Amino acid sequence: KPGVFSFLDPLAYEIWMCIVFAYIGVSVVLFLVSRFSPYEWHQPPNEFGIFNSLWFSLGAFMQQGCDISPRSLSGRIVGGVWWFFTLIIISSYTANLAAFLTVERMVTSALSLSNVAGVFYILVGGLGLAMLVALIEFCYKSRAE
Amino acid sequence: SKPGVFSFLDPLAYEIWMCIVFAYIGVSVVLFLVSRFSPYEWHQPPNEFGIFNSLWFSLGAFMQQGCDISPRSLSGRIVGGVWWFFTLIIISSYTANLAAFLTVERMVSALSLSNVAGVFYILVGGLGLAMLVALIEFCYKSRAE
Amino acid sequence: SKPGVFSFLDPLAYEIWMCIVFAYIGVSVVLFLVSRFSPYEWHQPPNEFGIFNSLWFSLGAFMQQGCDISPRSLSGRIVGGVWWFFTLIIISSYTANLAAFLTVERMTSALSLSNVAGVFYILVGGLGLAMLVALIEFCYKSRAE
Amino acid sequence: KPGVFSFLDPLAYEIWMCIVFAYIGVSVVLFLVSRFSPYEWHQPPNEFGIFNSLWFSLGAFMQQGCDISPRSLSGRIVGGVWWFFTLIIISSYTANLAAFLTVERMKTSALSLSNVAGVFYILVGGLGLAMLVALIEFCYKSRAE
Amino acid sequence: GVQMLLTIVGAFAAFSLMTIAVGTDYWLYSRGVCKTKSVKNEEVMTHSGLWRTCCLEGNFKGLCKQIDHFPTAEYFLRAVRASSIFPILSVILLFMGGLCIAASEFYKTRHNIILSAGIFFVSAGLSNIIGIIVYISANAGSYSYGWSFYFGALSFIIAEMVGVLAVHMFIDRHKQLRATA
Amino acid sequence: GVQMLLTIVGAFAAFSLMTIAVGTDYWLYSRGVCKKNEEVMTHSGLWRTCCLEGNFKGLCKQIDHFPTAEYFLRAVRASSIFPILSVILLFMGGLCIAASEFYKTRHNIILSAGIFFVSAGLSNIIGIIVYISANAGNSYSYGWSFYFGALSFIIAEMVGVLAVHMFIDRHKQLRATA
Amino acid sequence: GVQMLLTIVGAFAAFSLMTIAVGTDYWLYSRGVCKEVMTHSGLWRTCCLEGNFKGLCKQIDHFPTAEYFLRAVRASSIFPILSVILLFMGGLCIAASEFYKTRHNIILSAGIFFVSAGLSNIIGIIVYISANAGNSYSYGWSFYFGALSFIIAEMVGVLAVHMFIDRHKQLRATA
Amino acid sequence: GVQMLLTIVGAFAAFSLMTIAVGTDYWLYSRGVCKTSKKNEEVMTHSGLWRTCCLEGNFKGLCKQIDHFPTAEYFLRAVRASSIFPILSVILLFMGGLCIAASEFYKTRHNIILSAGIFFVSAGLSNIIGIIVYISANANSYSYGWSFYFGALSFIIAEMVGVLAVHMFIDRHKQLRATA
Ligand SMILES: CCCCCCCC/C=C/CCCCCCCC(=O)OC[C@H](O)CO
Ligand SMILES: CCCCCCCC/C=C\CCCCCCCC(=O)OC[C@H](O)CO
Ligand SMILES: CCCCCCCC/C=C\CCCCCCCC(=O)OC[C@H](O)CO
Ligand SMILES: CCCCCCCC/C=C\CCCCCCCC(=O)OC[C@H](O)CO
Ligand SMILES: *C(=O)CCCCCCCCCCCCCCC
Ligand SMILES: *C(=O)CCCCCCCCCCCCCCC
């Protein structure tokens, strides 16, 4: 039986720790360039604040939908390199995951739930955390009233 | 041999295909809950994340295809951010494990329409259901006037 | 071992490619129909799903690209949902089977330009056709002036 | 030891060079067919100048970017062919990479930071370049007051 | 006016094309036989359609046999493939689309007889996709499709184009009513 | 209200199904011993595995458990903490429903009901996942008790959205009066 | 204006570079026969590199239906030559744009010519590489001049379109 | 007000963490030698950026040097030996703190605060490169040590100070707009 969090095997511990560091760095460089200059504020020149920058850098990495898109030169450079980074990494994961599966299957074979059971705990755990965060916000404002 | 009509669901076990539906129905409801349970937010619904648009969002996020409206609060984003991670692994596990089947069974000592013929019936069947839903409404709206 | 111009179509059989075209022409028409057939929704186009935008949305969906217009009714969304599922399976099958075609050579090297050169021809051909379609119109407008 | 820039081995140097040449090409054509018409400017007919065309093309190749999409037959032919080109090429890189990993290019191991190392230098180098571009623009504007 | 003329011509074309496909035999240039048992076989090129199969070449050029479609989820496929319900239901739906189009030329007041035509044509096209897949899928478990199969494929395109055109006509009628009221 | 009736009926249904599941022994039709022996068909469950078509038809024996990270999962599956927890949360959801019909000025009770039902659904998912994952170490088919638990989840989640709407409607009415 | 000067200098650079490329002999440094050692081949001649002779610009045996069409193109080199023609025609237009100021529709013609010239050069590169891939080989200065010409031409094709746009903006402003 | 307080404390913490990291020797718990016959014996060691100090065996405490040099590969080794990037982050964080200190004295030049923001953000970027160049050059088990985590933690504490400083710049210029 495989480890609960065995879906993180097609990449090394040092690549996940570095992906998080690169994510944080990109989201703080994107914010910086967009909003540092005081010759663009009217209201803010764009919607790329610190909170939104994390969201757009997480969304970009997950190859998901849009809410905003950089419109400056400096900001677009950050976007471009981040998209290229994501491409390689996501391709590498899928490619190396298939390697793991194919070599393991040569030494039906439909992926059992035990193989991918940590993405479900994380999912329900995040849903649990999300509700809790919402209720903390609600309780705070409710008491203030 | 004779690949079964629904042989495109092989790359993942039955319990994964079941728990994905459960997780989808759960993420949508939790997204609906956090977004629209705050009496201290409506000034007229704050965000377009009702119960019917929270299922479209989740469906779009899983299928990859889909980019219309994204959460804008802290709670909603957490929900969408774990869902995005969930989708990534699951959609990279299908592809990777599908490749293993198509490689391992080839090494043994071009996909045909039959292999992917249970996804065409679903597509065409869905179009039929859609035309029945639309026409039903039309009829019910044309009778009342 | 010998490469062909249009050898990027090898994974999916001829019939699969043919039926994808038929399903694209079908989803698009059906999407148009539902959206715009009801005479109890216009007040002007209730949505942007004409006969031209529907074709673009279907093509977009399949190519895993952006969402200019997004379905909002119940019948449109059903059509969209099944189309997104079809696309997913089909695009995962191409990649999965291409990884097989590039391993276990039966009668590893870095893909050369000769393997993906038919695509470049189609790309340049499309650009040429687009410029023509744009200058034909231009001329037509010019004479009317 | 796996070279720093070992994320470019799937596709040949020519393919990489030709992608860049085709990217420039597509961008120029998408700008031309969209803005040359004297009978559409009422205020340009759309946001597809030479800068946004490059951004659209770049985003479309990376499988990200939901800023804008063409709204003209001439500009939608370019879009469609570019999306098709992208699909093939990105699938080719994700499939040929899995061939390299699965078949040792001399059990399986987990990709190490050494393997995907030039994608973090590019990213960090790009972030540096982005800030530099931003600061020089701000410095220039600050010397113009 | 002109839009209805295109629709009429296109309606007939798709119906005609599809009826010529379901009736002809030049669907699949296979490699089989044309005869049965006797008191060896002759594997020669055989243009085989839906119902009959004549040997293009060979000593028995022009002898058509009755395709034997029955030599859980596989029985159902055979039955559908054997009865060609989908390629025959497309012909039934395209014909009903023509009746609806013709009826709307004598009863102009009823605007809902034009929408019906559109749905019939669109649904006929969708039934001709299941026919294509069923055909190919069942035929699987060297060949070259012929002109009869391409008329069936071409019928779809023509029908779908008539389908959108009929929907456009329906909308146009109702737009006139929303401007004169 | 008609909406209130749906919630009440749906709440009871969810609770019923889930409790019937945890208590019955028809979760997984397998082929193993029930008392060196023979592998007759059996209908295992959560707390017991009772062979079905066998010489000792109707003999039921406590599921043999425990035969640090692996230790944690064993304890979670053995105690069925999650399946049981879902029942408890579903029960409390019903109590909240049967409390907004008396203290109908608070309206936070209905929101509690919603969260309880929605959180009882999430507990149910983890219970299913833990059950499917411990059955790792050929003829494993799922029975009606397993599908009653799964059916409860859907029924619970539907009550959850319904309750949130019921809560939202209360506040919308209060907003109009102001 | 400043834009016109660049459009002219750029056009010359593009045309000149590409003409040099088509005419030179240092496209791909290979290892083959020159009558087996290194041989800097080109588009029309494969000239020997070092050895008993060092200098012998032999001809290419381009011809030792998906392999006859490719060969025909590669051999005739239509596409590389076609780019040169289109770059030349774009230059005439710029020059004609001075004399016949009134006719603003000549500037756009130059833009299309330059843009289409780049697209012909793209097919050139692909056709060349694809057929020549029929040994450690490296691309010489001549090949990069061809590739650099494409870039310069595309840049002169956007600038021309801007100049055409600006013409019409002045027409729509004053009137 | 209190926003500046966090920045100062956070900037000091980031600086302090990184300096400890570089100077210490507990980066990589490997299994190697610590002594420059024809015999040998590999025992568990806690490597660092400069010295490989043994923590077990008869050589417990003997701190040997590391011959990083026993053209892509050369460049990697050259950078990894001098620790340019890890030390560069130290230099940048120290300079970024000077700017914040310089603020109180010169409260009429807003570019003092934005300078701190760029140094702190750029200090984080150097830290990323240092981690990568240490993990790539270094490549039978290993497990990074608290010293390596003080580096990683410094990056986070320096990126958070970076955004905080940039907000201070933004906020100050916003107050000027109001006065106008
Ligand atoms: C308004 C919306 C308009 C959207 C417009 C988008 C157009 C995209 C076209 C892609 C064609 C790609 C497929 C090309 C198939 C070529 C087949 C071929 O060459 O076949 C060779 C044969 O198999 C052996 O010789
Ligand atoms: C507005 C649009 C323009 C602005 C946004 C631009 C974003 C750039 C994106 C990706 C390129 C990243 C990779 C570039 C370098 C890859 C090739 C390379 O350096 O390869 C070296 C190798 O050693 C050779 O052998
Ligand atoms: C606007 C706010 C932004 C959105 C914020 C939420 C986004 C969450 C995304 C991904 C969660 C990934 C969780 C990964 C957990 C991995 C588990 C782990 O640490 O496993 C260690 C391993 O078991 C050792 O052996
Ligand atoms: C309002 C927005 C909601 C729109 C929602 C659109 C849903 C369409 C999505 C996917 C199709 C999935 C269909 C799956 C059909 C079942 C397949 C099947 O029966 O597989 C055999 C067996 O179950 C295996 O063992
Ligand atoms: C409600 O009042 C109905 C108005 C529209 C009627 C359209 C014609 C009937 C529906 C189509 C008939 C079925 C065709 C496909 C069958 C497989
Ligand atoms: C319509 O108004 C035509 C007159 C205006 C000129 C528009 C077309 C100019 C470009 C002609 C084609 C250039 C060469 C194409 C083949 C490479």
Residues in chain D: 145
Query: Which residues, 6+ apart, have CB-to-CB distance to A13 below 8 Å?
Result: none
- Cβ burial, residue G75 (10 Å; 0-12/13-18/19+): middle
Centre of ligand 6 to C-alpha G112, Å, is 7
Whole-number Å distance between alpha carbons of G146 and G19: 8
**How is residue G56 written in tokens?**
């012998």
Q: Are G86 and G117 in contact (CB under 8 A)?
A: yes
Rg from Cα positions in chain G: 20
Class (C level, CATH) for C1-108: mainly alpha
Phi, psi dihedrals of residue F151, rounded to the nearest 5°: -65, -35
What whole-number distance in Å separates Cα of residue F94 and Cα of residue F87? 11
Which of G66, G112, G129 has the CB atom closest to C5's CB atom? G66
Residues D120, E99: Cα–Cα separation, whole Å: 67
User: How far from chain centre, in Å, is Cα C10?
Assistant: 18
Give Cβ neighbours of residue H120 (< 8 Å, ≥ 6 apart): H11, H14, H92, H93, H96, H158, H159, H161, H162, H165
> Residue F44's beta-bridge partner residues?
F28, F49
Contacts of E5 (CB under 8 A, 6+ apart): none
Distance CA H38, CA B46 (A): 77
Cα-based distances in Å from F35 to A45, F140, G65: 74, 19, 75
CATH fold of E2-24+72-179, please? Answer: Butyryl-CoA Dehydrogenase, subunit A; domain 3 (1.20.140)
| Of the candidates C136, C134, D41, D48, the residue with the CA atom closest to the CA atom of residue G171 | D41
For ligand 6, atom 3, the nearest C-alpha belongs to C139
Q: Please, is G151 exposed, middle or buried when counting C-beta atoms within 10 Å of its C-beta (0-12, 13-18, 19+)? A: middle
CA D122 / ligand 2 centre spacing (Å)? 7
Report the alpha-carbon distance of residue G31 to residue G37 in Å, rounded.
5
- Residues in chain G after which the backbone breaks (C–N beyond 2.5 Å): 35, 64, 134
Distance CA E166, CA B137 (A): 20
Contact F133 A113 (CB under 8 A): yes
Is A113 within 8 Å of B13 (Cβ atoms)?
yes
**CB neighbour burial string for D51-87, b if at least 16 within 10 angstroms, e if fewer:** ebbbbbbbbbbbbbbbbbbbbbebbbbbbbbbbbbbb
Token representation of residue B138: 């039309």
Q: What ligand is nearest to the CA atom of residue D77?
A: 1
Give the integer Cα–Cα distance in Å for G124 and G111. Answer: 20
Q: What distance in Å separates the CA atoms of residue H153 and residue H14, rounded to the nearest whole number? A: 8
Cβ-in-10-Å burial (0-12, 13-18, 19+) of E163 comes to buried
Instruction: Return phi, psi of residue G32, to 5°.
Output: -155, -155
Q: Tell me the three state secondary structure of residue F34.
A: coil
For the residues of B57-104, what is the DSSP string, one character each? HHHHHHHS---S----SHHHHHHHHHHHHHHHHHHHHHHHHHHHHHHH
Q: From the CB of E115, is ligand 5 less than 6 Å away?
A: yes
The 3-state DSSP class for residue B111 equals strand
| Answer CATH for B1-109 from 1.10.287.70, 1.10.10.10, 3.30.1330.60, 2.30.40.10 | 1.10.287.70
Count of other CB atoms within 10 angstroms of residue H174:
12
Q: Which atom of ligand 3 is nearest to the CA of A122?
A: 13
CA angle A100, A103, A105 (to 5 degrees): 100
- Provide the residue type at E11 as one letter: A
Which residues of C are less than 8 Å from E163 in CB distance? 29, 33
Distances (CA, A) of B137 to B129, C29, C44, E118, G161: 13, 19, 20, 17, 51
Interface mutation target, options C113, C116, C123, C135, chain G, most CBs of G under 10 Å: C113
Contact yes or no for C113 and G129 at CB 8 A = yes
What phi and psi, each to the nearest 5 degrees, are found at residue A77?
-60, -50
Choose among E3, F58, G164, B133: nearest CA to D32: G164
Q: F141-142 and F28-31: which strand pairing?
A: antiparallel
Burial of B36 (0-12, 13-18, 19+ CB in 10 A): buried
Chains that touch G (3 or more CB pairs under 8 A): C, D
Type and span of the H or E element at C35: helix C14-37
Helix axes B74-107, B53-63, angle to 10 degrees: 40
Q: What residues pair up with A11 in beta bridges, in sequence order?
A: D111
Residue E64's beta-bridge partner residues?
A: E54
Please state whether beta strands G57-59 and G138-139 pair in parallel, antiparallel, or not at all (unpaired).
unpaired
Fold (CATH) for D13-106: Helix Hairpins (1.10.287)
Instruction: Give CA–CA dist G158/G149, Å, rounded.
Output: 14
E119–chain B Cβ distance below 8 A for any pair: yes
With contact defined as beta carbons under 8 Å apart, do F124 and F160 qualify? Answer: no
For residue A109, which phi and psi values (nearest 5 degrees)? -115, 45
Residues B18 and F150: beta-carbon distance below 8 Å: yes
Structure tokens at B112: 């045909």
Task: Output the DSSP codes for F90-159.
Answer: HHHHHHHHTTTTTSTTT-HHHHHHHHHHHHHHHHHHHHHHHHHHHTT----EE-HHHHHHHHHHHHHHHH
Helix (H, G, I), strand (E, B) or coil at A49: coil
CA dist E7 and E14 (Å) reads: 11
Q: Which of H148, H170, H174 to mutate to test the interface with A (most CBs of A within 10 A)?
A: H170
Question: Tokens 């590389």 label which residue?
Answer: G80
Pick the CATH number of A13-107 from 1.25.40.10, 1.10.287.130, 2.30.30.100, 1.10.287.70: 1.10.287.70
Q: Which of B25, B78, B28 is nearest to B49 (CA)?
A: B28
Tell me, what amino acid is at H102?
A
Q: Which residues, other chains included, contact H80 with Cβ-Cβ below 8 Å and sequence gap of 6+?
A: H68, H133, H134, H137
Q: Are B55 and B28 in contact (CB under 8 A)?
A: yes
Contact by Cβ (8 Å): E129, C27: no
Residues in contact with ligand 4 by the CB-under-6-Å rule are: B 6, 9, 14, 55-56, 59, 122; C 74, 77-78, 81-82, 85
Give the angle subtended at the CA of B49 by the CAs of B47 and B52, to the nearest 5°: 145
Measured between alpha carbons, how far is D61 from D16 in angstroms, rounded to an integer?
12
CATH of domain F2-25+68-177: 1.20.140.150
E121 CA → ligand 1 middle, Å: 26
* D→B interface, C-beta within 8 Å: 66, 95, 98, 102
Q: What angle in degrees, to the nearest 10, is found between the helix axes of C51-62 and C14-37?
A: 140
The DSSP H or E segment spanning D106 is none
What is the experimental resolution, given in Å to one decimal place?
Answer: 3.1
Q: How far is the CA of D125 from the centre of ligand 2 (A)?
A: 10
List Cα–Cα distances, C62 to D71, D91, F41, in angstroms.
18, 14, 47
Whether the Cβ atoms of residue F90 and residue F121 lie closer than 8 Å to each other = no
* Cα dihedral value H54, H56, H60, H65, nearest 10: -10
Contact call for E136 and C39, based on CB within 8 A: no
- Residue G99 CA to residue G92 CA, distance in Å, equals 11
**In this structure, what token pair is assigned to residue E124?**
């006929």
**Residue F41 CB-density burial (10 A; 0-12 exposed, 13-18 middle, 19+ buried):** middle
For the beta carbon of residue G32, count every other beta carbon within 10 angstroms: 15
* Sole residue written with tokens 């859907």: F154
- Look at residues H49, H20, H48 and name the one whose alpha carbon lies nearest to residue H154: H20
Q: Tell me which chain D residues have a C-beta less than 8 angstroms from the C-beta of B99.
A: 95, 98
Distance CA C119, CA D22 (A): 11
Q: Which residues contact F10 (CB under 8 A, 6 or more apart)?
A: F155, F158, F159, F162
Q: Which of C132, C137, C138 has the most ligand 6 atoms within 8 A of CB, as the residue to mutate?
A: C138
Q: Which of E48, E80, E77, E76 is nearest to E64 (CA)?
A: E48
Residue of C nearest to E123 (CA): C30
Residues 6 or more apart whose Cβ sits within 8 Å of residue B76: A130, B31, B34, B35, B47, B49
Q: Of the candidates C119, B114, G134, which has an alpha carbon nearest to the alpha carbon of residue E140?
A: B114
User: What CA–CA distance (Å, rounded) separates C11 from G149?
Assistant: 37
Q: Do chains B and G touch (3 or more CB pairs under 8 A)?
A: no
Nearest to D53 by CA among D80, D83, D23: D23
Which tokens is H176 given?
A: 């000027």
CATH: 3.40.50.300, 1.10.620.20, 1.20.140.150, 1.20.1250.20. Which one for H2-24+71-179? 1.20.140.150
Domain boundaries, chain F: 2-25+68-177
Whether F112 contacts F160, CB under 8 Å? no
Q: Evaluate whether G124 touches G79 at the Cβ level (below 8 Å).
A: yes
Cβ within 8 Å, pair D120-H132: yes
Contact residues, chain B, for A134 at CB < 8 Å:
33-34, 37-38, 75
3-state secondary structure of F43: strand
Q: Which of residues 141-160 of H touch A (CB under 8 A)?
A: 152, 155-156, 159
> Which of C66, C67, C99 has the CB atom closest to A98's CB atom?
C99
Architecture of domain G2-24+72-174: Up-down Bundle (1.20)
How many Cα atoms are found within 13 Å in the side-chain-facing hemisphere of B62?
22
User: Tokens in use for G140?
Assistant: 């010489």
- Report d(CA A33, CA H166) in Å as an integer: 10
Three-class DSSP labels, chain H: CHHHHHHHHHHHHHHHHHHHHHHCCCCEEEEECCCCCCCCCCEEEEECCCEEEECCCCCCCCEEECCCCCCHHHHHHHHHHHCHHHHHHHHHHHHHHHHHHHHHHCCCCCHHHHHHHHHHHHHHHHHHHHHHHHHHHCCCCCEECHHHHHHHHHHHHHHHHHHHHHHHHHHHHHHHHHHC
Phi and psi (nearest 5°) for B97? -75, -30
Q: Contact partners of C by the rule of 3+ C-beta pairs under 8 A?
A: A, B, D, E, G
Q: Does the CB of E136 have a partner CB in chain B at under 8 Å?
A: yes
Q: How far apart are CA H96 and CA H118, in angstroms?
A: 8
Atom of ligand 3 nearest to the CA of B84: 9
